[PDB]
Design a protein around this ligand. Sequence first.
Ligand SMILES: *C(=O)[C@H]1NC[C@@](C)(O)[C@](O)([C@H](CC2CCCCC2)NC(=O)[C@H](Cc2ccc(OC)cc2)NC(=O)[C@H](COCc2ccccc2)NC(=O)CN2CCN(C(=O)OC(C)(C)C)CC2)O[C@@H]1C
Ligand SMILES: [Mg+2]
Ligand SMILES: [Mg+2]
Ligand SMILES: [Mg+2]
Ligand SMILES: [Mg+2]
Ligand SMILES: [Mg+2]
Lengths: 204, 241, 250, 243, 231, 244, 221, 196
Amino acid sequence: SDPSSINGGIVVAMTGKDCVAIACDLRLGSQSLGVSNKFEKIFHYGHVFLGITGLATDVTTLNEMFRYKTNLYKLKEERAIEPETFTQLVSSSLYERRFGPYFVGPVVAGINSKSGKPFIAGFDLIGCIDEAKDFIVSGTASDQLFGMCESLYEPNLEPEDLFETISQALLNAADRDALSGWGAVVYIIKKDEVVKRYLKMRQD
Amino acid sequence: GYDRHITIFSPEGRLYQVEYAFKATNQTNINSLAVRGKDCTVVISQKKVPDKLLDPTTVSYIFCISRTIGMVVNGPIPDARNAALRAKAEAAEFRYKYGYDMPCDVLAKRMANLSQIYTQRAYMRPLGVILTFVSVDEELGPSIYKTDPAGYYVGYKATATGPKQQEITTNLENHFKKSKIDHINEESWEKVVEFAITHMIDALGTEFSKNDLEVGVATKDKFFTLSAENIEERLVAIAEQ
Amino acid sequence: MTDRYSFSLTTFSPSGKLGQIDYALTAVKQGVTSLGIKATNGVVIATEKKSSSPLAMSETLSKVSLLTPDIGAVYSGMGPDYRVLVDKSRKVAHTSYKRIYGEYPPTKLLVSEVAKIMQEATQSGGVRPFGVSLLIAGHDEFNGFSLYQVDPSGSYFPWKATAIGKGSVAAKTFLEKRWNDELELEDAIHIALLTLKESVEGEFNGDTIELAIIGDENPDLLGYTGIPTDKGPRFRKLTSQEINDRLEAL
Amino acid sequence: TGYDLSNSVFSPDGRNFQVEYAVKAVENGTTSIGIKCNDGVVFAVEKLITSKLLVPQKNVKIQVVDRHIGCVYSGLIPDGRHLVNRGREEAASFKKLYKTPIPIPAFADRLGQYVQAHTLYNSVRPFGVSTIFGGVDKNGAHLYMLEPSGSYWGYKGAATGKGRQSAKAELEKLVDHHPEGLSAREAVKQAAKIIYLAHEDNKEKDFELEISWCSLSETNGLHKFVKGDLLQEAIDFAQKEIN
Amino acid sequence: NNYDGDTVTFSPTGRLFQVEYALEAIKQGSVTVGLRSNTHAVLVALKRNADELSSYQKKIIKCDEHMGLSLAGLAPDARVLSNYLRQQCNYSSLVFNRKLAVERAGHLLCDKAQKNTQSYGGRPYGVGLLIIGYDKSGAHLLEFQPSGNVTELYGTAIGARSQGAKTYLERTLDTFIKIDGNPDELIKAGVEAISQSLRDESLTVDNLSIAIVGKDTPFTIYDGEAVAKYI
Amino acid sequence: GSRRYDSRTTIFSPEGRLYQVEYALESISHAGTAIGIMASDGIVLAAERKVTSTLLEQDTSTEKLYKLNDKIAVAVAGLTADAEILINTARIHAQNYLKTYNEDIPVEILVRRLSDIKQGYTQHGGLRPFGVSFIYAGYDDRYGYQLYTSNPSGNYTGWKAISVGANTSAAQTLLQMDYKDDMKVDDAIELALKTLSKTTDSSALTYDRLEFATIRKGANDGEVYQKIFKPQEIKDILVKTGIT
Amino acid sequence: TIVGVKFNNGVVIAADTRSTQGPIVADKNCAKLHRISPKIWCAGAGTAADTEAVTQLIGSNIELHSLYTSREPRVVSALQMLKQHLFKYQGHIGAYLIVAGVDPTGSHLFSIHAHGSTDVGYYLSLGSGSLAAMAVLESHWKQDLTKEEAIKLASDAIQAGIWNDLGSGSNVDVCVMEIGKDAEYLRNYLTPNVREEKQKSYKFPRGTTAVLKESIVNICD
Amino acid sequence: TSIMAVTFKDGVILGADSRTTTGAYIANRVTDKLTRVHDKIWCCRSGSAADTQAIADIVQYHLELYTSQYGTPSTETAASVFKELCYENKDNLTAGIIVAGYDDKNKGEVYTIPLGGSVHKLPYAIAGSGSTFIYGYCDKNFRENMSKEETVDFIKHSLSQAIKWDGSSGGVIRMVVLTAAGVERLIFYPDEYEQL
Ligand SMILES: *C(=O)[C@H]1NC[C@@](C)(O)[C@](O)([C@H](CC2CCCCC2)NC(=O)[C@H](Cc2ccc(OC)cc2)NC(=O)[C@H](COCc2ccccc2)NC(=O)CN2CCN(C(=O)OC(C)(C)C)CC2)O[C@@H]1C
Ligand SMILES: [Mg+2]
Ligand SMILES: [Mg+2]
Ligand SMILES: [Mg+2]
Ligand SMILES: [Mg+2]
Ligand SMILES: [Mg+2]
């Protein structure tokens, strides 16, 4: 009866030098019962990346809804939505359901294709925007992730260094949470190539 | 031609029902005139009580819209009163929603936008009235804004409306070519009222008794209409001149 | 009581004309001349303030309206119709864009919404078409400078330069002579003033000409400092003084 | 042309022919008058006795609004009743919110704005009555006359229907030769006379006289009908003055 | 002529033709008489058959224990108006424990008919009604007409050749007005009245409809064998 | 009342024709010609602009050719503003389908819904019909490459080659003459231009009066690419097919 | 912690830069100072999304109002629109706002509560840190503050909140609205909570993390 | 809160304290609880600050529109508009309002509207949490037709006691004098009224 912790799962995003990283675990459960080992929580619309933790039905629904809105955007604007603009679209859409919210912790990551600037943001379930230069965390092990990120993180990491940091931050936070883990995915995002790595992690 | 019956375009791009509404403007056979002082705005309209059975006190075409805004109508009284009640409602709603007194030019714009909707939607006829709004606005100072059945409106240094309007207009344009300024350079509203009546007399070639006029005055933080006595005082001042 | 006109007042005639759109365009033809020119580094829109009475104060009548900090509009045709379109245009920029994306719409998409409103008055029950053509000048980061014409039908087209109303036929010929793709904004203002001199009968000065530009950002017009990435409106109305400076060098 | 087939259409004159046609149905009606007095108003009406079968005294046409307002009308009688029903809702609504009974000028504009509304659309017909109404409020006595256009003014005396010009002639005479005022009891007699006089313009059928009054001294500012001794007294007064 | 296309259009002389055409449907309707004393009120109606093989149209409808009416014109319009009056009589009872005054019934019918004469797309009622009742102020007869004009009378008649009975009642006035505490005598004076509106036919046993209401008499309808007494 | 001013936009003539549909088609017959040609390896859409002025912005304009989704495009003949209302509806309808089924909308389903909307305006509501005819070019994994047209009547049909707007009688004769089934996209391009070249009411066909689009498999293995040609790309194709 | 202080020729509002989710700091440098219009600024405490959303809605409607009337927006309009909106929603929109600005009418300072009650004052504080801040305001405030005195008092009042309230921390943001001039927004006016340099670099040797699979993602068409 | 309205020879005087509390915390110590709904019709507010402000704003709106159409409304008319809002919405409102006004015909009038939305015309009225403590005092010391100075003293002494005993009341004593001579605002500071 706490929607945000029925299914479990975590998302973390970090900025580095001319790059961003966004990572998620693969667990979907029904309380104690692990159900699926392949439930990915990171989606993308063009070059803008969205991670969603929380109630899994709302994760799936919001992804389907933002794919819908960014498709119409692209047809009318004749260009892909940028991360700053998408962040505002997510915020508007969550606050529209103010008195019947989606039970989710969305995380935006991407590089502004014009300025070249790396961008991350996070939100509460009703739409409030937390924009941080350093890192954003979300999900059942957000306390653990805040702890790991705040120690491990330093500014201006090269993509291959940033990979080690975000990975270690997620891996060690998931291992201290019952409802998170069961496999992880890490997206390393540079100006014009995106590398996606599945991490080997303990399966308990 | 049913293009002459509702507010749709004629072949030559015209709205006859708007044009015919302008003609209803002059049915009352009353001329109105507004001028700005330094500190005040004065609006005078001819008062004509033909029937002896009428209560002359109830015969008016000047309306108190808000504390600060006055309105003179050139047109039939039913449409005049429709416009009055609506402006009162709008000026009160504005004050409740936005926490300040509706400005003269904003009420004018709002009544003009309403008028425009009648020129575009078929089921509403235009009102056969021209509305002259006057106040001393807290931002813009002495103000005259006029609205017609086309939904047109603009601000005026001074203005006249009615059948003999063109004579009053040129009379005022002549004064302002000479005077070289935007307004009546006068301290007291009493002497601006005297100017307004004097220049109406010159332009119409007729004299007035106290019962032949009706006068509205806007000062900072109130608009009020003069009694028969207030005007008699004003007419006597003009006599000894 | 209430609207019983739920049927269209604009219908196809046997020739396939839409009578009421044709007649709206005739109303626009009668309207006072307005024009727009697109330079490399900005856009100018200009029109005559043909005053009704000389007792009128024609500065209280704005024919050139800001729609967003970076978009301006001018018209030829029925003034009241323009005024309520400006009101609806400003509002739709907020309700259908800014309240969603937290930024002002790009020029073509605000135009697209204005066009939509005007199309509806062409087909909805119990209304006549709008009796105006609009020229909308605007800037946006990804499209740069643009100029659009919108007609009573709801049709819009982008222009390097054009004119609408009274003397539009002559004005367009004059603009064709003078327009090149290397015009600086000051060059376009100069041409706009020459073109508008053709179709102006009486007085030609800063008090009878209304002229606005979509140009450089004006931090001095923003109203606040301290946010470096907010640099202020690109829409600027030229003052009576500023117009008269360029008439001495005309 | 054809500008007169649809209510709310302006003619090239700037006229609404359907309202002007409504007036003809009013001009066609029985005569009715109102007389403003010192501290009140008097209403009277001519009722054509169609047939001997009409029960005398029992087809009342003067209608009360609230407790303090009398309404009488010439023209289409059902249109009159419809306008009074609306007036009664307006006075109820006003009293409900503001506690005080509706002042007469306030009440006048409520009827005015409603009647005027029936000249704004082609889906309604204008009212086929001129309405004479008024009474006593906190500011004193008020008589009004309201026309199918929605036009109304305050009146010293008023008349409408077939005998309006005969009635108006006799009213102008009262106004001229009583400039300091007329008493409420006097106005009842004068009313009787003017109805008997104005009946000459309508005299195939013989008629029934009906009077009402609001007087701050005589009825305590309430609307009552004139009956019994006072009615017969005014009937006798009028019978003298025709010979 | 040009001004008769709808109820919302005045003629240049200030007439409503759709209302006048409505009034015409009554004129074409079969005759019905109403008349009253101080104690009783009687309705007599001539019922019209389609041919020799048909029933005779019901003209009289009961509205409450103390009120009823007779119709001439469109029968369905009478059904709507009588149904509306039944509801107003009901409402008066359930809410105020009060039998509806015949005068108030009159006013309510007038205002209901009026709405249809001022609004677009509607049509005037195509029926005339005579309403009898015995309320707290004695016996009453009303004449309703679809213009909205309701009239209180000692007696009247409406429909085809009604003028005959209407003149006779005007002559008889002083006789019948005082048939107090005699049911049979008021009915026979009603039967005599309707007989002035007959041509090439007289009152038969399934032709004639009589209704009475009075001091100690519920509104009740006499038809068939129970009117043989009165021919 | 208001009946007097009602045109009755949704009634039958004595011959059982819809007046307003007939008059809308008459309106469309004066619009710039649009051609669709379907090859075995893609579809061509070519449309002629309503006579351009030398001062119209050529590249940033889209009068005729619109994107519905990544797999479907339309060519428009008629009132542009009417077309834009229907296009935004079609774009939403395609996105509703993707949201519901997690599959791109089949071309016919989209076409049928737009045609059903047009039909409605001819049967109820007493409004004027849409003064628009569409050529739909699209691809789905069921029927592959497809051309359809719809018109104000709400009727729709499938085509190998079709034209709408002005001089369709002339254009359908020339297409019927030179179209073959085996035809590749590059030949279909040449046919489209040669056909407009001959039916045009202009003296000569130039780059600045043309909107041109292809839907090929001409990217990376069994995935579909939409190409809306820039001014320069049309100007080049106009020289390579030898019309300039 | 949010404060407003009136002075001779204007009004100043200040705020801390801490955002919290339960006992966790979500954002160490969020901006709680919001622009309703160029010369009307808002400080927000309560439900974070509610104060941002209500500030933007009224800010949008105020911009349209300004364009419709051809007038500078007034603080009393922002006040009336906010209070009527918050009232309609009977406190379910958890917005607590200090609304300050300059307009043609002069300089104004107001507080709005979630239920739609408003207060006038020369100095105000709101939020968890309001008592710490009000202690400083009640100790130092005098009639006829200069600009520099009002800024110092406002930042002193926020510092009380940063130090003594667990709900407040990090930096001090100021907005100065002076009659006649442009509002100046001093982002991170004071930064007295800089993180000390860490003892160690946790930068990992490359290839520390164990990987199952790689792939290039396609963001192109 | 401690609020009262007292009728006297020349008109009516409204009195209130200036303290607003959230629990034991004084949210505002210089509150104005004397609020104008018309030139010479004022009210004293007690209850939810949101509810009484929203009501007072709506009444000011109704009376400004009343004035436009029918001229100056009576004190009774103003009280009737407050009652209408308070009674019809009794389930969603916590509002105790005293309405005080000056007509030139009717002189000074006081109407109290307690939580139910009932209306009571009184020679004087007291309300707010602090009123409980001065019922005894006010009943003993009030006389009809007092002078301006006597009525100012009666209110000052009365609210002085209410403030002394009620923790919810305090700050300055604000008063508003309503007579033919116009409208007068009075303020009395702690250092004065405390040691009465
Ligand atoms: C000074 O006094 C200072 N005190 C600090 C503080 C924290 O009290 C605050 O009021 C801030 C101010 C805001 C800072 C951000 C800019 C806007 C103003 N308020 C918060 O930080 C609030 C605290 C708060 C208040 C009231 C609450 O009632 C439920 C809860 C929490 N923070 C939030 O609301 C918080 C914001 O999350 C930021 C964030 C960003 C990115 C990722 C994650 C988080 N979010 C929540 O509290 C979420 N909460 C979930 C449930 N909810 C809810 O309503 O549930 C439903 C089902 C009913 C919808 C409410 C929101 O500053 C003052 C000045
Ligand atoms: Mg685990
Ligand atoms: Mg386990
Ligand atoms: Mg119209
Ligand atoms: Mg409440
Ligand atoms: Mg105390």
